[PDB]
Amino acid sequence: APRPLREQYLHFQPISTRWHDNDIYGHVNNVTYYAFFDTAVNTYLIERGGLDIQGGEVIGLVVSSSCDYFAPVAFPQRIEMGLRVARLGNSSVQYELALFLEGQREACAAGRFVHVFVERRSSRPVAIPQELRDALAALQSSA
Amino acid sequence: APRPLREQYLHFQPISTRWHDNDIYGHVNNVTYYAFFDTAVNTYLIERGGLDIQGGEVIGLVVSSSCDYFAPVAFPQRIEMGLRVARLGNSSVQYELALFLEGQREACAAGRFVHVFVERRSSRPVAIPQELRDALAALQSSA
Amino acid sequence: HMATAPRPLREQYLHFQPISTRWHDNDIYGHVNNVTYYAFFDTAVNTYLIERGGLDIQGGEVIGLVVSSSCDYFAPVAFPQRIEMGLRVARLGNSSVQYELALFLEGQREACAAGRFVHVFVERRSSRPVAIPQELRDALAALQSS
Amino acid sequence: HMATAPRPLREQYLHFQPISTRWHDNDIYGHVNNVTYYAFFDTAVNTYLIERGGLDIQGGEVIGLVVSSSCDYFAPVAFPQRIEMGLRVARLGNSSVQYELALFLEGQREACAAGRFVHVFVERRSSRPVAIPQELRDALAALQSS
Ligand SMILES: [Cl-]
Ligand SMILES: [Cl-]
């Protein structure tokens, strides 16, 4: 089975839920979890890896992603992303994430996604800059 | 001129920003401010006024809204909604809100919106339930 | 029922644009969320600016920034209903413009929601207001109610 | 370039659906954000379930819940480009179904992104898995690659 626990992740981010996260069936819509993934990863890249989204030469593009869902959460509930790095490559990295509900031990959902690092003007993949590598390595998972 | 200050509002909510709040021009998109409005109002209605979004008999529908924007914010910046109630009617209420950037005194943006309270099944407007009125009145603005 | 402002009519608008509705346009109460309407406003205007004004959002030097907006809601709509935005230009200044929009059921004549927004155009890198470029102004001028 | 998985072809899909792009589909890097693709998946499937399966999202007793999904991205697209979702059903169980989708430029044949999701159908009030209702199953069956 699962399920994922908080101590299996390296870094955490609270994310506040918004009215419109819920859909017609009353819980956070599956699409929104990936917004959560994307937000946790890039928040980390900016505060700890020197990512410059406004004018930086090198950017992370999502080449792929996925998620399994174990139990719903709903606005206005309080949640938290665990983030870890499964592998750091030469020009890409695979993240693993998990959504946690405040007060619950087991993850509501767990997924992965993959960045490739490219030159912003051309979109040629490029070796990950060093400052970013240092930050990404600091997230290395245990398994 | 403006601009709005924090002490002119009754209740506050931090809202975390998400990767995708920024648009192609790099700042939080104007549309998202109203998601912020909607989130601050309904969060308050649920924790302090007994709003039951899942199964409640009475709901708030937005009959109108607006916003003026004074200066941009951007993900991953940290922000905060001030909320106040300009007037409580028999079956509607006008809220005033303002977006604040952490560390800035003056509001980035300020807007209003109007709820009408209806019966969920029929959508007949109905007098605001008492528990909700108590909470809404506790937000009354000074001017 | 909802906003008590008088409902605008299809004829009061110049230019129309279908927008396809999306699963999550509906919120928990089951109709399109009020915020999404503003996304419809942005999309209609900008689609118009790119196909008729020559707006270059990727590398253009002059951009349009939103300084205010508002909307009144008259009757709900829901995914997967088919909808259509009405657009016109109410006022055309040297560096700013006010748009008026209304959402229709593509099968219908009464507006379901209507509002307004203001663009100010600015040099992209600095954000100093510049005058509206002629190509865009020519496209805006074709939407001024005669 | 991006995902290195082999790109799916337009012919491998059964059913198509235009989706209009929106201003804020583009993120700060200027192309449609990866998350939005999944919104396109949800919309295509559900549009299909309502018009061909009789899904009643407002008051129906059986609903479809998403238990997993994934997507590979091959080439970016951008508002205001015109796009089209390809849909087919890969597997049809008693209470679950796996969909496969791909996004195309409506003018084009190579997929720009492709992925998958799984619906489990459940009694709406409880969320106990129920079998898929016959009307929906008949619509799902028409998408199984022959
Ligand atoms: Cl805009
Ligand atoms: Cl769904």
Helix content of chain A: 10-25%
Helix-and-strand structural type of chain A: alpha+beta
Roughly what fraction of the amino acids of chain A lie in strands? 25-35%
Q: What fold name stands as the CATH topology of chain A? A: Thiol Ester Dehydrase, Chain A
Query: What is the count of DSSP helices of chain A, taking H or I runs of 4+ residues?
Result: 2
Query: Mind telling me the CATH superfamily name of chain A?
Result: Hotdog Thioesterase
- List the strand order in the largest sheet of chain A: 1-3-4-5-2
Bound molecules: chloride ion
Sheet with the most strands, sense and barrel status of chain A: 5 strands, antiparallel
Gap from first CA to last CA of chain A: 15 Å
User: Biggest interface and its residues per chain?
Assistant: A-D, 24 and 28 residues
Number of strands of chain A: 5
Total of domains of chain A: 1
Shape of chain A: globular
Radius of gyration of chain A: 15 Å
CATH class membership of chain A: Alpha Beta
Determine the oligomeric state from the structure: homotetramer
The CATH architecture of chain A is: Roll
- Secondary-structure element series of chain A: EHEEEEH
PDB class: hydrolase
Keywords: putative thioesterase, hot-dog fold, hydrolase
Assembly: tetrameric
Entry title: Crystal structure of the PA5185 protein from Pseudomonas Aeruginosa strain PAO1- orthorhombic form (P2221).
